[PDB]
Ligand SMILES: O=C(O)C1=C[C@@H](OP(=O)(O)O)[C@@H](O)[C@H](O)C1
């Protein structure tokens with residue numbers, strides 16, 4: 567598709583769609599709890615839809631009526647064998663978290679994904695899961711999808727120290743622990759998004775958090791809840807950047823989740839000297855309105871501890887860095903290579919084809935800033951963030967064109983992206 571270029575101004579209010587991580591979990595917790603669960607303002611991107619259909623395939627009734635999602639919980643030991651293999655689509659969150667969900671399934675199921683998902687390692691989740699008594703295997707020693715999983719009625723509690731800063735592995739193990747008899751202890755390597763921890767408590771469950779050590783007693787019974795999903799910061803991130811780098815711009819992003827384990831981009835924007843104002847803070851829902859204005863930025867260093875707080879924002883931040891004076895280093899971000907695409911190589915190639923000056927490294931990239939961008943053709947390779955990153959970049963192309971192939975990839979997390987972009991070009 568042809569992307570809009572040489573924008574002269576961006577003004578407007580935007581209510582980004584729901585948080586992907588929380589939406590995924592709302593369905594999982596909704597299915598595992600006893601009673602009814604209603605989810606409001608859920609993200610309807612393809613990844614969340616894949617999660618919902620997976621559970622419907624497992625016998626869970628999930629109705630989407632008049633903008634409200636209603637789930638009829640099945641217990642905690644209530645999922646049933648699916649008629650066909652479970653289609654995880656492009657969702658790594660779905661396959662990894664659900665692998666832990668099915669840890670107690672007394673049947674064998676197959677889980678597959680698209681071309682993108684099929685190249686991603688599941689060993690990080692199969693290894694600990696097998697310690698609990700779950701039988702799981704994929705292709706090659708890295709257990710690439712498709713996977714075959716057979717749970718057990720005799721799940722043993724898990725004692726595992728994560729070797730990587732992954733919230734998905736932590737969450738998969740927590741769902742499994744909820745089904746096992748005994749005390750499980752999960753130790754994070756670095757603090758990662760704590761959405762599973764928050765929601766377990768919201769659905770009546772219990773856990774102990776002592777620093778990076780998470781203790782979960784099993785088995786537990788949960789209760790259906792009313793879940794209101796906040797705007798996804800990862801989605802708002804595209805506009806936070808666009809508002810900072812485009813000329814004569816001021817964007818206001820309302821109802822954006824502000825959980826401390828997800829606000830890495832805010833610290834980066836500050837370090838770089840961007841004009842950011844945070845107002846209308848809701849201390850209970852952890853949401854706020856974020857306002858950005860055209861700014862002159864300076865490069866910064868992005869590493870340790872901060873990575874898991876902005877892991878998904880690195881693609882847009884790289885663009886942000888291309889517009890700052892000086893160098894910006896991103897390291898300790900080896901996890902980028904294993905996402906929907908190798909986001910170190912693809913991001914580097916995409917932006918370099920547009921004005922460049924990004925040097926990819928083994929654990930990240932080094933960007934030398936203040937590049938005037940120009941036209942280019944970019945393929946999404948099935949990664950929604952590459953697409954949206956390129957769209958925002960295109961706005962800065964003064965003269966030339968930008969073709970984005972496989973742009974539908976964006977629908978996995980932000981279907982209404984272009985509608986929002988269009989609403990900002992006139993204001
Ligand atoms: O648990 C979650 O909801 C997520 C965890 C992250 O992956 P890792 O756990 O692999 O870092 C992130 O990239 C993904 O989009 C959402």
Ligand SMILES: O=C(O)C[NH2+]CP(=O)(O)O
Pocket residue numbers: 656657658659660878905906951979
């Ligand atoms: O949303 C993102 O930026 C990365 N998601 C990875 P997944 O959810 O497929 O594991």
